[model samples]
Target: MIERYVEFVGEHEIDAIFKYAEKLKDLSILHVNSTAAGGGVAEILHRLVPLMRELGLNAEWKVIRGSQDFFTVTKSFHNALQTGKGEIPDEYFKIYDEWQEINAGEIPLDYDVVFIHDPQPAGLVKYRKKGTWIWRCHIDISNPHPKVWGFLRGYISKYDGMIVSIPEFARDDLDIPQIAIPPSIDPLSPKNMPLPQTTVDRIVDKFGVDRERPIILQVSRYDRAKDPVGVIESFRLAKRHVPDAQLVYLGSPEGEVVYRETVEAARGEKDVHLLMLPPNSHVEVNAFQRAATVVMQKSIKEGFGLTVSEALWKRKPVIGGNTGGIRIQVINGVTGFLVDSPKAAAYYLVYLLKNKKVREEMGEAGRDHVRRNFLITQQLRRYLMAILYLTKRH
Candidate 1:
């Protein structure tokens, strides 16, 4: 199964993976997270588990069930942790713990290594019956509010180790050893693979997008951090310079009211297309990225913008927000440019549209950049190394 990725990751890396997995082929690992679809964590696990299984490790993924109100509180905790504001009231804890207690009773903890993701199941560490417990945080929580962090710190301290996307996101007071493993994208996935030009054209027509005009695309979930409205504003400004340029907001329907807010904001914008695609529409997303001339991820905050890598893999130069993990992907004037505001993002869009040679050059650079660093096989290797380290240390 690992050989399937050799065309993307090369034989040397594949050989190393086979060697590494040999040490831990007998161990059992389990991963727990909030959702099974509609977000990056689910997207990653969809591809990650199969590869781990192929290597002979017994790996399984479980999503904790929650009520809508439970998710609402978790969502609030997500935003509050990212922005470092808004005190979480006591009721939030009451609801969070109630679900945690319920899930602890229902979910089994028999694996050799149990990896729990994000704040949704962070408290699950308390029910650890066997194996080493690991806490994985995907959001940018470097500057979380003191009051909220204090409440969560008790759960975090119990983990044997921690994994954060970047070094800066690791809080100094975390006594457990922390590893920096940035998120990765699967090159062979339909969402990132090269598409037939005919399919691209058909998808373009289906979305009412103008293939003759330059297309600026932003593919992200509907969330405040992604700043979909800001992308629309940037599109409006860029249209002044290149009137024929079209913008598409292709996103999964995760945040119900937030998705509606973006659609309402783009009501009067010309040549702007809004799509709330279902979670399994990878082929449609593949076609849209292939159709795009330049991609934009104008996020207000990010935990390593996977969309940037997706665009880069499609050989499209990206304009990403100058925050969080976007800083790691966009090589600033090489693969793409990083912008802080709508005006700055629009400025780059206009420049790229006018300069075909530079766009082509950046696209080539962007493809190579992702190929070298952000492929799924490389991430798989890192996971194996972490497992080896943990088991040996234990």
Candidate 2:
């Protein structure tokens, strides 16, 4: 699996990856998360686990089982962490811990390193009897509700180390060591690998999107933070400048209220296509991105918007929201513009649509930017180094 990346990352990177992977070849590494489907974390693990095995490391992924009530609480935790608002009731903490206790009894802690993802299963650290436990927060924790954050802090305090997506996302108050390890995309994945013109056309045609028209695409889960409604508004505003432009919203369903609201809002719009894709539909995602003229990730809050990286990887300029990790990728007029609202997003979208030369230049620069910084090879190197550092061994 690592060999596939060499053509994209070069032989030198592959050599460096092996040099670090070799040290932990005999050690077992486990990743525990809430869901193994329907999110960025799942998509990454799907690609990362196989590559880890290919490198001769005992890498494995585990999903924590929880009840509907438990997820409802965690989802609130997610909201509070991202917006720094909302209050979670005290009873919810008991529910979260009870599930963690259940999981700890069933899942072993014998691996050399056990990495816990997000706040869902963060409580598992309290039950760890062996191994070095690492808490990885994949959300935008730059600003969080003090009450909710205080609640989770108890569990986080027990971990050996922590990882976040950006430096600002780290909590300065935490006594434990924390590192910012940005997320990455697999260039060789089906969603990112190159596709023929015919393949791209046929896929778009199947979705009933006109190949003659320019597409403004946004790919993300149907969640409030992603602002699917705002995307529609921006597309509406962009239509005045580029009359032939079409809006394509495609992603898996996670929030029923947000998804239904977005669908209701789009029903009144023209040339708007809404697709509810199943998880792991990489080929379709690849096609939608390739067919797009400008990709938008106007998120209200983001955890290193992978969709932005995915679009930039395809050499397409992305207009993203000016928040969290999105600010790290969209370099405001270089790769793409960082926007604040639907009006601002539409301004950038219209600008990119009107200027063909700037679009091409930005697209080229965006792809090279991803190659140098956001590729899976760089993530692999970082993860290997973190493992070595945590293990405290040569």
Which candidate leads in lDDT? 2
Which lDDT values do the candidates have, in the order given? 0.88, 0.89
Error of 1 at 61 (Å): 0.9
Q: For candidate 1, lDDT tens digit of each residue in 208-290?
A: 78899889999988888899988998988888899889999998765777777777778887688988888889999889988
Error of 2 at 359 (Å): 0.7
Instruction: Write candidate 2's Cα lDDT for 199-285 as tens digits.
Output: 999989998999798899999888889999999989888888888999999978558888888888788767999888888789999
Instruction: Tally clashing residue pairs in candidate 2.
Output: 0
Look at candidate 1 and give me any clashing residue pairs: none
Please count the clashing residue pairs in each candidate, in the order shown: 0, 0
Model 2 scores worst on lDDT over the 10 consecutive residues at 385-394
